[PDB]
Design a protein around this ligand. Sequence first.
Ligand SMILES: NC(=O)C1=CN([C@@H]2O[C@H](COP(=O)(O)OP(=O)(O)OC[C@H]3O[C@@H](n4cnc5c(N)ncnc54)[C@H](O)[C@@H]3O)[C@@H](O)[C@H]2O)C=CC1
Length: 165
Amino acid sequence: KAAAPACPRFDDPVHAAADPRVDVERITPDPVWRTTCGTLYRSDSRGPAVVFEQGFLPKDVIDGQYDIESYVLVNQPSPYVSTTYDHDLYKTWYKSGYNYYIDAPGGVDVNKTIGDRHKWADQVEVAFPGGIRTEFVIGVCPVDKKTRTEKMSECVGNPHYEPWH
Ligand SMILES: NC(=O)C1=CN([C@@H]2O[C@H](COP(=O)(O)OP(=O)(O)OC[C@H]3O[C@@H](n4cnc5c(N)ncnc54)[C@H](O)[C@@H]3O)[C@@H](O)[C@H]2O)C=CC1
């Protein structure tokens, strides 16, 4: 047995951003940044050919919804790409198609930022302002709609993944 080490700390809180035009000063409320470095996950209907090329780009870093709770409660175009601590959250999506695996520094820990009492605290979300570059996307597993399970013989690793810890 070995105990795990601690995580590297990047000076830039949006070091992972695919779109660095994100304005961290406009995040509300004041963000509590994730300091751990475990695998995160994201349900996305887009195929790996798309995501592995572009990374996870946010829908509107300029004029989007910068308020976390507003974005959590009412999904609308925002500077954030949503991820979860929960490997199994894909089972709650309607035909989300893929469960992406992410190894990225930072992100805003939603429940630490807005509390764990809101309606969707159960999503244990980490919101990445500016999105996530492809080098931090590990890979993906397709989801079988009927059983809400991963098709594990069809998982694919991202050739652009660059381990950093
Ligand atoms: N998706 C997840 O695994 C998680 C989502 N959430 C919550 O769910 C809601 C967000 O769910 P999402 O489906 O992530 O909304 P989202 O708008 O990020 O993605 C919705 C769909 O839009 C498309 N899409 C996303 N970004 C795009 C882009 N840059 N260009 C083109 N098409 C794009 C994809 O088909 C994606 O499945 C928020 O309220 C958030 O709190 C929280 C935890 C993780």
